[PDB]
């Protein structure tokens, strides 16, 4: 996306990873599997949660009754009332419409950014002890058993 991870250098997602939004998939001589990075997932959750809440909760509303009722000799103020309604009903339409369009773009980018920062987080630890296969993967130049795999996940990977 804006950060080139989703549908970017890491094209396609994992049906397999079912415990989070972003995460990993290791493969060593012991076996394989998916594991969502719990922190970045939890955080992204909290933020999007907070974002939705804001968009919803920031909406103020006064108790009111829109309709008005004017007679055949109050056409002018009827049209005025009409102007006010179509007026606000046109403001909120352009807003709701764009607010979503613009925010959706943001949210997608947010996720993309999160994936790229996670990728970059690992690529950091490993460094030379792994080769980058431009598909979102790293191939350890060494043996990395499950304790080792866990190591890199919880950010405690050794001498790089």
């Amino acid at each position: 996306g804006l950060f080139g991870a989703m549908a970017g250098f890491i094209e396609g997602g994992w049906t397999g990873m079912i415990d989070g939004w972003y995460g990993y998939h290791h493969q060593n001589e012991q076996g394989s599997g998916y594991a969502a990075d719990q922190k970045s997932t939890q955080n992204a959750i909290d933020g999007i949660t907070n974002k939705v809440n804001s968009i919803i909760e920031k909406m103020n509303t006064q108790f009111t009754a829109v309709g008005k009722e004017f007679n055949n000799l109050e056409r002018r103020i009827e049209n005025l009332n009409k102007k006010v309604d179509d007026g606000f009903l046109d403001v909120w339409t352009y807003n709701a419409e764009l607010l979503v369009l613009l925010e959706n773009e943001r949210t997608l980018d947010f996720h993309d950014s999160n994936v790229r920062n996670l990728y970059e987080k690992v690529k950091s630890q490993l460094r030379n002890n792994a080769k980058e296969i431009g598909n979102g993967c790293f191939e350890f130049y060494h043996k990395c058993d499950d304790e080792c795999m866990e190591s890199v996940k919880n950010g405690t990977y050794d001498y790089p």
Binding site: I55, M59, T64, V66, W92, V100, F140
Partner: protein, 324 residues
């Protein structure tokens, strides 16, 4: 030995739109557009609405014969007229400041109907039994409104009447009345004798003095005559005074109402059920959780802003790109 950092994907087919690309399938979305109702007229914040059915506001308050059930009317948060609300001013004329009264009485807290000027008692030296019209027919028989009383001439003498009511109800009192307008200057006498008749309503906040406006005019639903209906809210402790040499359709029953705020009049044929809601529309109640709604421009309560859109889905998860 290898490790890959990637992202979630599922069987979601929800799609959202972004400034850059239309219809993007995402793993998880959220709707911000209320577009469904319960097709029921609910209670707006604890208190139920007022149904009028075949009757309309003017008919209800004036005492039209077809509105007998509305004689108990109590409390209510908003009024409901239907596509059948047609029994109103059975006797032709103009209801002064009708829209205004309609709006001011949309929401009432306390509302009692009392007899301000008792028929059998008041109006001595005046005829109070012939005041009936075929326009306001009750079960074939000729009748008249139930809150107003048509005072006519006593034999061949209609003397000056002058009665006054003073509000000691400890709350506003809606006083409705009427002034009758014969078509001819011949009828003006056959009914109220005095050709130069007049009517006058006094109050520490009202002073208009009417006279009958005789004039030839088309017969409406029966009569060529006309009756203008008037109203006023008499403050606590104030005293309204009526006096007239003829043409007065005197108040019989008035209402000791107690309004606090103002709502409105929903007009729909949707069923009234014992549900509740913060937002009510003509098609049914809306949910006030989301920030926008497209159910109806006309609403009552704390409602989502009405918008012309049909889809406002917000992305929460990410782009959905599965396929294993």
């Amino acid at each position: 030995d290898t490790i890959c950092i990637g992202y979630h994907a599922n069987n979601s087919t929800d799609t959202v739109d972004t400034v850059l690309e239309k219809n993007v399938t995402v793993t998880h979305s959220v709707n911000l557009l209320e577009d469904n109702h319960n097709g029921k007229l609910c209670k707006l914040n604890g208190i139920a609405p007022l149904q009028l059915g075949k009757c309309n506001v003017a008919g209800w308050l004036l005492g039209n014969p077809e509105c007998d059930l509305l004689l108990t009317a109590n409390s209510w948060s908003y009024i409901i007229e239907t596509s059948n609300s047609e029994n109103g001013t059975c006797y032709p004329g103009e209801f002064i400041d009708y829209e205004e009264l309609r709006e001011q009485l949309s929401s009432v807290s306390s509302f009692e109907r009392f007899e301000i000027f008792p028929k059998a008692s008041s109006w001595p030296n005046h005829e109070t039994t012939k005041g009936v019209t075929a326009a306001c027919s009750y079960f074939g028989a000729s009748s008249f409104y139930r809150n107003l009383l048509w005072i006519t001439k006593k034999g061949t003498s209609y003397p000056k009447l002058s009665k006054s009511y003073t509000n000691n109800k400890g709350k506003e009192v809606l006083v409705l009345w009427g002034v009758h307008h014969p078509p001819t200057t011949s009828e003006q006498q056959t009914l109220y004798q005095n050709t130069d008749a007049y009517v006058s309503v006094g109050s520490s906040k009202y002073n208009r003095r009417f006279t009958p406006e005789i004039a030839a005019r088309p017969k409406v639903r029966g009569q060529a005559g006309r009756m203008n209906y008037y109203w006023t809210l008499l403050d606590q402790g104030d005293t309204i005074t009526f006096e007239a040499t003829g043409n007065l359709i005197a108040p019989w029953y008035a209402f000791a109402l107690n309004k606090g705020s103002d709502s409105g009049i929903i007009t729909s044929d949707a069923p009234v059920h014992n549900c509740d809601t913060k937002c009510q529309t003509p098609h049914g109640a809306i949910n006030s959780t989301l920030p926008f709604q497209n159910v109806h421009p006309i609403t009552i309560g704390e409602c989502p802003k009405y918008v012309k859109s049909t889809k406002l889905r917000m992305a929460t998860g990410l782009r959905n790109i599965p396929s294993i």
